[PDB]
């Protein structure tokens, strides 16, 4: 792809410090500021039930792969203009790789 396997352990700790404030990834986990992310890979953006997404995410209609996810995480608003996800992004590909590596495993 254009994504390379990283540290799942490293990714688990980046999640906890960079995403946990607004998201859950476990199956049966509640939506919080942001939607529960279990089952996110292979889904289109804005389709979790019982969550209120912006018109923008839904319409963007992104199919989520390790690779799209990377571009998103780099600069979210730059990738989906009008998204309400208030995260600046992950500039370093290495942090992104470890985080995606983690996400691919815990959201399965
Ligand atoms: C709160 C300050 C957030 C932080 C920190 C992170 N995210 Fe987030 N995310 C947030 C919201 C409010 C939303 C929905 C935005 C909207 O415009 O409707 C999102 C969305 C996502 C998505 C898309 C989910 C989908 O179902 O399409 C993903 C993949 C996602 N968020 C992941 C994610 C990661 C991995 C984060 C840490 C690096 C992270 N977000 C930070 C709120 C917040």
Curated annotation (Swiss-Prot):
Modified residues (N6,N6,N6-trimethyllysine): 77-78
Source organism, top-level taxon: Eukaryota
Cofactor note: Binds 1 heme c group covalently per subunit.
Keyword Electron transport: yes
GO BP term, example: mitochondrial electron transport, cytochrome c to oxygen
Amino-acid positions noted as binding heme c in the UniProt annotation, renumbered to this chain: 19, 22-23, 85
Signal peptide as annotated in the record: none
Keywords noted in UniProt: Electron transport, Heme, Iron, Metal-binding, Methylation, Mitochondrion, Respiratory chain, Transport
Modified how: Methylation may enhance its transport into mitochondria. Methylation occurs in fungi, plants, and some protozoa, but not in animals. The precise role of methylation at Lys-78 is unknown, but it seems to preclude pro-apoptotic activity, possibly by lowering affinity for APAF1.
Effect of residue 77 to R: Loss of methylation by CTM1
Cellular component terms per the entry's GO annotation: mitochondrial intermembrane space; mitochondrion
Other observations noted: Present with 7330 molecules/cell in log phase SD medium.
Membership in a protein family: Belongs to the cytochrome c family.
Protein task: Electron carrier protein. The oxidized form of the cytochrome c heme group can accept an electron from the heme group of the cytochrome c1 subunit of ubiquinol-cytochrome c oxidoreductase. Cytochrome c then transfers this electron to the dinuclear copper A center (CU(A)) of the COX2 subunit of cytochrome oxidase, the final protein carrier in the mitochondrial electron-transport chain. Isoform 1 (CYC1) is the predominant cytochrome c during aerobic/normoxic growth.
Protein name: Cytochrome c isoform 1
């Amino acid at each position: 792809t254009e994504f390379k396997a990283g540290s799942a352990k490293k990714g688990a700790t980046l999640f906890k410090t960079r995403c946990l404030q607004c998201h859950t990834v476990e199956k049966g986990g509640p939506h919080k500021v942001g939607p529960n992310l279990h089952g996110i890979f292979g889904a289109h953006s804005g389709q979790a039930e019982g969550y209120s997404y912006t018109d923008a995410i839904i319409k963007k209609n992104v199919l989520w792969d390790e690779n799209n996810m990377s571009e998103y995480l780099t600069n979210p608003k730059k990738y989906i203009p009008g998204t309400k996800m208030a995260f600046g992004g992950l500039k370093k590909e290495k942090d992104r790789n470890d985080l995606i590596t983690y996400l691919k495993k815990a959201a399965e």
